[PDB]
Every structure is written in structure tokens, then in C-alpha cells.
UniProtKB/Swiss-Prot annotation, chain C:
Keyword Nucleotide-binding: no
Function: TFIIA is a component of the transcription machinery of RNA polymerase II and plays an important role in transcriptional activation. TFIIA in a complex with TBP mediates transcriptional activity.
Disulfide bonds listed in the record: none
Organism listed in the record: Homo sapiens
Name of the protein in question: Transcription initiation factor IIA subunit 2
Example of a GO cellular component annotation carried by this entry: cytosol
Gene name of the record: GTF2A2
Gene Ontology BP term (one): transcription initiation at RNA polymerase II promoter
Quaternary data: TFIIA is a heterodimer of the large unprocessed subunit 1 and a small subunit gamma. It was originally believed to be a heterotrimer of an alpha (p35), a beta (p19) and a gamma subunit (p12). Interacts with NCOA6 general coactivator. TFIIA forms a complex with TBP. Interacts with HSF1 (via transactivation domain).
Swiss-Prot record, chain D:
Broad class of the protein's primary localization: nucleus
Name by which UniProt lists this protein: Transcription initiation factor IIA subunit 1
Post-translation changes: The alpha and beta subunits are postranslationally produced from the precursor form by TASP1. The cleavage promotes proteasomal degradation.
Keyword Transport listed: no
Family note: Belongs to the TFIIA subunit 1 family.
Organism encoding this protein: Homo sapiens (Human)
Entry's Gene Ontology cellular component terms: cytosol; nucleoplasm; nucleus; transcription factor TFIIA complex; transcription factor TFIID complex; transcription preinitiation complex
A GO molecular-function descriptor: TBP-class protein binding
From Swiss-Prot, chain G:
An MF annotation (GO) of this entry: acetyltransferase activity
Gene Ontology terms describing biological process: DNA-templated transcription initiation; meiotic sister chromatid cohesion; positive regulation of core promoter binding; protein acetylation; RNA polymerase II core complex assembly; RNA polymerase II preinitiation complex assembly; spindle assembly; transcription by RNA polymerase II
Full protein segment contained here: 80 to 237 of 316
Reported effect, residue 110 to E: Inhibits interaction with SSU72. Reduces interaction with SSU72. Inhibits interaction with VP16. Inhibits RNA pol II transcription activation induced by VP16 but does not affect basal transcription
Organism: Homo sapiens (Human)
Posttranslational modification: Acetylated.
Annotated protein name in UniProt: Transcription initiation factor IIB
Tissue-wise expression: Expressed in the inner cell mass forming the embryoblast. Not detected in cells from the outer thin layer trophoblast (at protein level).
Family in the record: Belongs to the TFIIB family.
Recorded coiled-coil stretches: none
Core promoter DNA-binding: annotated span: 110-114
Keyword Protein biosynthesis carried by entry: no
Effect of residue 106 to L: Reduces interaction with VP16
Curated annotation (Swiss-Prot), chain H:
SS bonds (residue pairs): none
Organism: Homo sapiens
Subunit and partners: Binds DNA as monomer. Component of the TFIID basal transcription factor complex, composed of TATA-box-binding protein TBP, and a number of TBP-associated factors (TAFs), including TAF1, TAF2, TAF3, TAF4, TAF5, TAF6, TAF7, TAF8, TAF9, TAF10, TAF11, TAF12 and TAF13. Part of a TFIID-containing RNA polymerase II pre-initiation complex that is composed of TBP and at least GTF2A1, GTF2A2, GTF2E1, GTF2E2, GTF2F1, GTF2H2, GTF2H3, GTF2H4, GTF2H5, GTF2B, TCEA1, ERCC2, ERCC3, TAF1, TAF2, TAF3, TAF4, TAF5, TAF6, TAF7, TAF8, TAF9, TAF10, TAF11, TAF12 and TAF13. (Microbial infection) Interacts with HIV-1 Tat.
Annotated protein name in UniProt: TATA-box-binding protein
Disease note: Spinocerebellar ataxia 17: Spinocerebellar ataxia is a clinically and genetically heterogeneous group of cerebellar disorders. Patients show progressive incoordination of gait and often poor coordination of hands, speech and eye movements, due to degeneration of the cerebellum with variable involvement of the brainstem and spinal cord. SCA17 is an autosomal dominant cerebellar ataxia (ADCA) characterized by widespread cerebral and cerebellar atrophy, dementia and extrapyramidal signs. The molecular defect in SCA17 is the expansion of a CAG repeat in the coding region of TBP.
Gene designation per UniProt: TBP
UniProt: DNA binding residues: 9, 45, 60, 99, 136
């Protein structure tokens, strides 16, 4: 679950890049040096619990658009 | 008063029990040490006056009257201190004539 | 994920070579090999800590030393390892220490 | 002596890895094969910026690269030095001198720099 | 492989029995919950313990 | 015998020896400190700065900087305003 | 320029759940509270070795001068108080050893000595060098030696 | 006077002008040690100048142990060149001698009691704390440790001239208290 | 009739309770820090006298 908040921080720096694009969890876990096993499944249960309260927006489809106010 | 009541007042007082407030935030299975103090065996010396040099000397009553000193005697208590740190060993150090 | 000192010795090298052979034969997975190495490190640390009860001495001269992350890397020359039962002479030695 | 300690270490290692071999679901024959192979394998410069004015101010760095000479790996409790000499309370550890291995509990060392 | 699936189902029954056959011992004096809590605590130690391994490998 | 002249009190020398042996907490790399912080938060949601310092074993200023980068202080009815380890 | 309030009588003084004195009185400033605590510590330390009140007053004045001068603001209060007590004993002509002052103060001998040097520099004053005869009376009396033995020891040392 | 103090230690600070990685320096250097729990810098020693230098991540370095100004500068340059060999852009900027220490003997016992009585404004003699008398000279900002055996140690000097001048000032005073 | 003895006994009861209270407080501070407080320093001699 802590690694999950770390993924949130990662996507926050991703916003900071400005190259935010519709993504998924596997590529982030790879780029953050973490694996894809049943651990990813339990942390994805936690991640969907996050999707129930993702003030930092994490939607399932085309997503990650956190800022409630966002133009450039 | 001096012979009985002072000693009885010292003995009647409950022993001092002290322990830390969950120090170090560790497993804390009674980890904070317990310090127990028990006062005993009160002793009184003869009236004594300590000079500016710090050298003790007997104080005669007339000298107290002339120099406006107070006619008093030192009061000493044996104190036993026990440390219980849950290390399976308790050490009971004794301090004589405090 | 342990102290990892004795891996770079005769014993650790032999264990690593055996694990490499089994990996080449596909008999064991690399994760299993790493787990075996970790368990070996634990067991060897415990064994040296417990079953060794002998006191040794040595003297000599120091030519280099390094320290980082609580790891000493002394480099001595013309060392004489003296023990009550036997004496050993060595031209050079490297002492790696950790704690 | 040292071989006997090695055999005891073998017993400890196999006992310690049995539980992992059960956890990972791998058959126990792996441990037997591992032990067999392991045993077989064992037995006036005003403008001072340029530093090139001095050369050969170092020594050969190949000693640490080689490491072929004798190597001692242990743990240290206290290490003191007083302006000339290095003093060593190295605790239980292992030594590799001339191939033959040595085992110790307390190691005391004095060296000069 | 089908037999291995059956053995895994048996291990699931064995863990339920062990957790519940004494979630009762605690009551007589939640076991699964306690185990989960214990597992949660190690994670922090493990990594503090673990990355030291990475630097020690670099050091030696 | 009372109040005998001593160079330094015994308890003080013991405490000083313990502190010297322990040493000052070192400033570790940002990545490892962040990972430890995230695991700590995984334990449960709310942490006080003092015990978080104990858990992380990092300098208070460095830990405060790293925590201000991601975490946020919430004023709460628990006892006081404390840190929140959730970045959002 | 302050006062304080008590319980008074039993009626409206205590209110809904025992308000007490409406409050707690809450008086003063740190530039005086720290000095007050230091004065209390000085009296305690002096009574531990039965120092006379004149030495206590000299110590209090020395501490006031040092505290207002503020070159030792970084040093812990008790160290300053202990060094001031040592200096007052030296100026009064009845020196106590640094170990003797440390025996009654929680501050170590090294810190007491450092603060003593700093206080000497801040006050721009000096203390007469100690002689073997200064400690003869106290040492002999604590050892319960006869007067002739004390005289012999003083003469031998001198 | 016929006596000249001899330098026993010189402290010099020089800025390399570039940030450094202390862990990398510790791993790659020869005689360097790095214990961030104990001290925040890296301690390195070179035997040929027989000196020790502390290297900080800010790029500033302090060199101590040199018996001469030239030895101090050469040792600092050698440490900078070692760091440069480790790949860093180390330079030699604003090298300066922060402190110098000298020692000498007057060859006669000295009555420190009379000395402190005469020069109480500059003297500080506390046998409880330290057996040597501490003299704080004003015209040169030098602190002198005078001992009953006659040994005199001077410290706090930026240049050798300060050491020599301070000894020249103190020698007649000491001659006035010869035991 | 309360003579000198009983009156001084009452006063000494009060002051010894206060002395033990002060020892409790002073030792508790050091115990919280983890230092092994000195008993002689804890006793405030001025209270009784």
C-alpha cells in the first residue's frame, strides 16, 4: 500500500512532465522497478479502493487527470 | 518526636514507584525500567555549624544566641534504590546516611 | 537481503558455482538460488558466531585502508598471524570488516 | 577440525533451506543434488588551477582489482588509531590464507601506516 | 496439474481450520487478522533491512 | 560521605557513552527514505512526526523537507495538527 | 507589579465544574523566570554543601550579570549557575574544587570549567590563584583530623 | 633571544569549487574513510606529506598536520588531484592558512604563579582544568600554552611571522620569571 | 493538650510528604529521558529545614 502511494507520487511527477497520457499500471510498475505478480493483484485491490477515493484522479480507462482545475 | 515519630513518619510513607512512559516506542513489553525507593533508618547528628570554609564544627547554644544562628542538627536517612529493567536482574543499591 | 560477507570466499564461491550448474540444467530457478544463498548466509553467520571459541592474534604493517557504509577494507603487508598453537606468515592481506 | 565445522555448516544449511524448498513448491531432490555438486566442487605558479604540475603522486591500484592474495572477512567491534598505529578488535570471522581456511572468535591486530 | 489444484484447495481448507480452530483459543482465553497485522509490521523492517544489502554489495 | 567530589556523575557518563555509540542519525538517500515512509503509512493512516522520525531514523530537517514535498499537515481533533502521509 | 488570587470563599468561586479561580494566574516573562529557576538551583546547590548565604548572594549577582551580558546564552543554565557558584566561592576566599561543585550539580566538571572560563571573560574580572592552604581546613575537618594534624599538613604543603 | 619556535601543525582551507559525492569518494579513494553517523565529511590521509584532510560535499577541504606552509599547500594540491583523478572537476581555489601551531622550549623552569599575578589581564592559570598556563597575547592574536617545564606552544597564528613575533614578545616576560 | 512533639510531628509529616513529592518529580524527568538519576541530587534539603 505504501508502494501504491509511491506510484501516486510517480504519476504526480508525470503530471509535472506535462506529457500525461492515458496509461495503465504495468508500465508504471516496470518503470518504478517493481514486478507483476499476485502482489500486483492485491495492490490492485488496494488500487481500486483508491479509485473509490482518488482525489488524485485514477480512473480505469483514459485517466490520471488529477487537477480539478487544469488549463495551460 | 525525635526518637520515634520521625522514624515512624519515614517508614509510614509509601515507597516511591517510578517508571518511564513507554520510552523508545519499541515492543514495550514492560520495557521501561521500574525504579523503587524506600527510606529507612533515620539518623540524627549532634548540632553542628558549618563555617564559610565549609568545615563542620559543633555549635554551642551560646554561640547560636550571639551569632543569631539556628540550633539545628543534621538529619540523615538510609535509602534503598532498586532498578527493575525487565532484564531478569534487579539491582538494589543502598545509599547510606543521605 | 542480509549481511552478505562470506559469499566472496571459498565456501560461497562453491555454493554459487553449484547453483549456476543447476540453473544451467534448469533444475532450480534463479529465485530459488538466491533464497538458498540467503539461507546459507544466515546459517553460516550463526555457525561462526556459536561454534567458534578460539582466540587469535596478528601483527604487521598497514598499507591502505577504506571505510564506507560501516565497511572497513584494510590492506596490510608482511602480516604475522600469531596463535598460541601455531604461527602463520603472509606477505600481504586484505581485511574486510562489517558490523 | 575445519572440515568437521564445514560438515556441521552443511547440516545447518540444508535444515535451513528445507522450509524454503517447501514454500516454493519445489521437490526435495534439488537439495540432494545441490549438496552432491557442492561437495564435488569443493573437494611561481600564480595561476594554480592546473593540477598537472605534479605527476606520479599515487600508487598502483591493481591490488584491489586483483584480490587474488589472501583475504580475511570478519566483523569488527572496536577499531582505534592513535596517530601512527591501527588497532583491531575483530570478532568472529573467517580467513583465507594460502588457500587453507582459518576460523577464529577474537582477533587482535596492530599495524603501522 | 489438476491434482496440484486439488492439493491447493486442501491447503486452503487447512489454513481455514487452523485460523478458526483457534480464533477460538483466543476467545477461550481473529487469529488470521492478527497474522495479517504481524505481516504488515515486517514490511517496513524488511526494506530498511533490504536496501542495506544493495549498498553492501556495491561496497564489497 | 554525602556529595563526594566526582568528576562526572555516573548516570551522565553512561548516557553519554550510549549516545556516542549510537551516533547521529545519517541523512539517507531520498528514494530509500520515501520507500520507508510509504511502508510506514501502509501500517495505518495517521502518524505523528516524533514517532515517524523514530521509524525513519533520519534527521528531523531532512525528513521534514521530504515530508513537506509529498505529505500534508492536517489540523485534527485527535489531539493536534499532525502530518498526513497520503500525498493527496 | 503583579498580584494573585486564591480560592476565597465557598460559593460562586467554583462554577459549572469547579472553575476554581476563574483561571490560573499566569504571571511573568522568561527573562525573569529563567533567572528565578537559576536562583532556586543555586540555593539548592549551595545547601547541598552548606554554603553560607553571602556566597549564595554573590553567586546570584554573578549570574545576573552573566545572564544579562548574554555571551553564554548558548550554554545551559545549570552550567552557568555552577560556574558562578565556583567563582563566588573563589572570590569569597573559600574555594571549592571543580569536582566539589560537580558533586552537587548535574553539570560535569568539563562543562563547569568551560563556563567558568567564559564567565571570567564576560565579566572581565579575575580570581586569585588557589593555594594549598585554602583546602586544608575543609579537607582536615571532613577527615576528622586533630587541629595539630591540620596545622602540620598546612605547613608541609606550604 | 636565540630561540625560534618550530611549527608542529598547520591548518589550511581550500575550496575545490565543485560539489562532490562523499560515498563515491570513500568507495574509490585509497586512504579515505566516511562515517556519516560520526562525521559529515570524508577523512583522508597521505603519508608522504604526513597530513590528514577533511573533504566535504560542498567542495571545501581542510588540510591539517603539515609542518610547513609549502607542505600544507602541496598536500592540499595532492588531495585535490586525487579527487580530480576520481573524475570530479576539483580545482584549487582560495587556498588559505587558517591556523598554525608552533612549539619551543625556553630551557628553564618558569614560575607560572608570578606570571599570572603580573599579567592577570592576559593570563589564565587553572591547575584543576589544565596544568599549562594560557596566555592571550593581544598585539598578535596568539594563545600561548606555557608550562613549568619551560615548553611553550603557540597557536592561533595565520602566518609564521605571528608565531615568531609572539615568541619574541613573550620571551623577556618569561625571562623575568625564571625559576 | 498538644505539646511540642505532636506539633512538630504534624509539620514533619507534611514536609516529608513534600520532599517525597519533589523526589518523584525530579526522578521522573530523568527516567523519561533514560538517565539513571542520582538520589542525592533528587533530595531537596531545604524543604524540611
Amino acid at each position: 500500500f505504501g508502494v501504491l502511494a509511491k506510484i501516486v507520487n510517480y504519476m504526480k511527477t508525470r503530471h509535472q512532465r506535462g506529457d500525461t497520457h492515458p496509461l495503465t499500471l504495468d508500465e508504471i510498475l516496470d518503470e518504478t522497478q517493481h514486478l507483476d505478480i499476485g502482489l500486483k493483484q492485491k495492490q490492485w485491490l488496494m488500487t481500486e479502493a483508491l479509485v473509490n477515493n482518488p482525489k488524485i484522479e485514477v480512473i480505469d480507462g483514459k485517466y490520471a487527470f488529477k487537477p480539478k482545475y487544469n488549463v495551460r | 518526636f525525635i526518637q520515634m515519630s520521625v522514624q515512624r513518619i519515614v517508614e509510614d510513607a509509601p515507597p516511591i514507584d517510578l517508571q518511564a512512559e513507554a520510552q523508545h516506542a519499541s515492543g514495550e513489553v514492560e520495557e521501561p525500567p521500574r525504579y523503587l525507593l524506600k527510606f529507612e533508618q533515620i539518623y540524627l547528628s549532634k548540632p553542628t555549624h558549618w563555617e564559610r570554609d565549609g568545615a563542620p564544627s559543633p555549635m554551642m547554644p551560646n554561640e547560636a544566641r550571639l551569632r543569631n544562628l539556628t540550633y539545628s542538627a543534621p538529619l540523615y536517612v538510609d535509602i534503598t534504590k532498586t532498578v527493575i529493567k525487565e532484564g531478569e536482574e534487579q539491582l538494589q543499591t543502598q545509599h547510606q546516611k543521605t | 537481503m542480509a549481511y552478505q560477507l562470506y559469499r566472496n570466499t571459498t565456501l560461497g564461491n562453491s555454493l554459487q558455482e553449484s547453483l549456476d550448474e543447476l540453473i544451467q540444467s534448469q533444475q532450480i530457478t534463479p529465485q530459488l538460488a538466491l533464497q538458498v544463498l540467503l539461507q546459507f548466509d544466515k546459517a553460516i553467520n550463526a555457525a561462526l558466531a556459536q561454534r567458534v571459541r578460539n582466540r587469535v592474534n596478528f601483527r604487521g604493517s598497514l598499507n591502505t585502508y577504506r571505510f564506507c557504509d560501516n565497511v572497513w577494507t584494510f590492506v596490510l603487508n608482511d602480516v604475522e598471524f600469531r596463535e598460541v598453537t601455531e604461527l602463520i606468515k603472509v606477505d600481504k592481506v586484505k581485511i574486510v570488516a562489517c558490523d | 577440525t575445519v572440515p568437521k565445522l564445514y560438515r556441521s555448516v552443511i547440516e545447518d544449511v540444508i535444515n535451513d533451506v528445507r522450509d524454503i524448498f517447501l514454500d516454493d513448491g519445489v521437490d526435495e531432490q534439488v537439495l540432494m543434488e545441490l549438496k552432491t555438486l557442492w561437495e564435488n566442487k569443493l573437494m611561481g605558479q600564480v595561476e594554480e588551477e592546473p593540477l598537472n604540475s605534479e605527476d606520479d603522486v599515487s600508487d598502483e591500484e591493481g591490488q584491489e582489482l586483483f584480490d587474488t592474495e589472501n583475504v580475511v572477512v570478519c566483523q569488527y567491534d572496536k577499531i582505534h588509531r592513535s596517530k601512527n598505529k591501527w588497532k583491531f578488535h575483530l570478532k568472529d570471522g573467517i580467513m583465507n590464507l594460502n588457500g587453507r581456511d582459518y576460523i577464529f572468535s577474537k582477533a587482535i591486530g596492530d599495524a603501522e601506516w | 496439474a489438476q491434482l496440484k489444484f486439488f492439493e491447493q484447495l486442501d491447503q486452503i481448507e487447512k489454513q481455514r481450520k487452523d485460523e478458526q480452530e483457534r480464533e477460538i483459543l483466543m476467545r477461550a482465553a481473529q487469529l488470521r487478522l492478527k497474522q495479517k497485522a504481524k505481516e504488515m509490521q515486517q514490511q517496513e523492517l524488511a526494506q530498511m533491512r533490504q536496501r542495506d544489502a544493495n549498498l553492501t554489495a556495491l561496497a564489497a | 560521605t554525602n556529595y563526594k567530589p566526582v568528576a562526572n556523575h555516573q548516570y551522565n557518563i553512561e548516557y553519554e557513552r550510549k549516545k556516542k555509540e549510537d551516533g547521529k542519525r545519517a541523512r539517507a538517500d531520498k528514494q530509500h527514505v520515501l520507500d520507508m515512509l510509504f511502508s510506514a503509512f501502509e501500517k495505518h493512516q495517521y502518524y505523528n512526526l516524533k514517532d515517524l522520525v523514530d521509524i525513519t531514523k533520519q534527521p528531523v530537517v531532512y525528513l521534514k523537507e521530504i515530508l513537506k514535498e509529498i505529505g500534508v499537515q492536517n489540523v485534527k481533533g485527535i489531539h493536534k495538527n499532525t502530518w498526513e502521509l497520503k500525498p493527496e | 507589579l503583579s498580584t494573585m488570587i486564591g480560592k476565597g470563599t465557598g460559593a460562586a468561586s467554583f462554577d459549572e465544574f469547579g472553575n476554581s479561580k476563574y483561571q490560573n494566574r499566569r504571571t511573568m516573562s522568561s527573562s525573569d523566570r529563567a533567572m528565578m529557576n537559576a536562583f532556586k538551583e543555586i540555593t539548592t546547590m549551595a545547601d547541598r554543601i552548606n554554603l553560607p548565604r553571602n556566597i549564595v548572594d554573590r553567586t546570584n549577582n554573578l549570574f545576573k550579570q552573566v545572564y544579562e551580558q548574554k555571551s553564554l546564552k548558548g550554554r545551559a543554565n545549570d552550567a552557568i549557575a555552577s560556574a558562578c557558584l565556583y567563582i563566588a566561592c573563589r572570590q569569597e576566599g573559600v574555594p571549592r574544587t571543580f569536582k566539589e561543585i560537580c558533586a552537587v550539580s548535574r553539570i560535569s566538571k568539563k562543562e563547569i570549567g568551560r563556563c567558568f572560563k567564559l564567565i571570567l571573560k564576560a565579566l572581565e574580572t579575575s580570581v586569585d590563584l588557589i593555594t594549598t592552604g585554602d583546602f586544608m581546613s575543609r579537607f582536615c575537618s571532613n577527615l576528622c583530623l586533630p587541629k595539630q594534624v591540620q596545622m602540620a599538613a598546612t605547613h608541609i604543603a606550604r | 633571544s636565540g630561540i625560534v619556535p618550530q611549527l608542529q601543525n598547520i591548518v589550511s582551507t581550500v575550496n575545490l569549487g565543485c560539489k562532490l559525492d562523499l560515498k563515491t569518494i570513500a568507495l574509490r579513494a585509497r586512504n579515505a574513510e566516511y562515517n556519516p553517523k560520526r562525521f559529515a565529511a570524508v577523512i583522508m590521509r597521505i603519508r608522504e606529506p604526513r597530513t590528514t584532510a577533511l573533504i566535504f560535499s560542498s567542495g571545501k577541504m581542510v588540510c591539517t598536520g603539515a609542518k610547513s606552509e609549502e607542505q600544507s599547500r602541496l598536500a592540499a594540491r595532492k588531495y585535490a588531484r586525487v579527487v580530480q583523478k576520481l573524475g570530479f572537476p576539483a580545482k584549487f581555489l582560495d587556498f588559505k592558512i587558517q591556523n598554525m601551531v608552533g612549539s619551543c622550549d625556553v630551557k628553564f623552569p618558569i614560575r607560572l604563579e608570578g606570571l599570572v599575578l603580573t599579567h592577570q589581564q592576559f593570563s589564565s592559570y587553572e591547575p584543576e582544568l589544565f596544568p599549562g598556563l594560557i596566555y592571550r597575547m593581544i598585539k598578535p592574536r596568539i594563545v600561548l600554552l606555557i608550562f613549568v617545564s619551560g615548553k611553550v606552544v603557540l597557536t592561533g597564528a595565520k602566518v609564521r611571522a605571528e608565531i615568531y613575533e609572539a615568541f619574541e614578545n613573550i620571551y623577556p616576560i618569561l625571562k623575568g620569571f625564571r625559576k | 493538650l498538644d505539646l511540642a512533639g505532636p506539633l512538630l510531628a504534624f509539620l514533619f509529616r507534611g514536609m516529608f510528604k513534600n520532599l517525597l513529592k519533589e523526589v518523584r518529580i525530579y526522578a521522573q524527568k530523568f527516567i523519561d529521558r533514560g538517565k539513571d538519576f542520582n538520589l542525592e541530587l533528587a533530595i531537596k534539603t531545604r524543604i524540611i529545614s
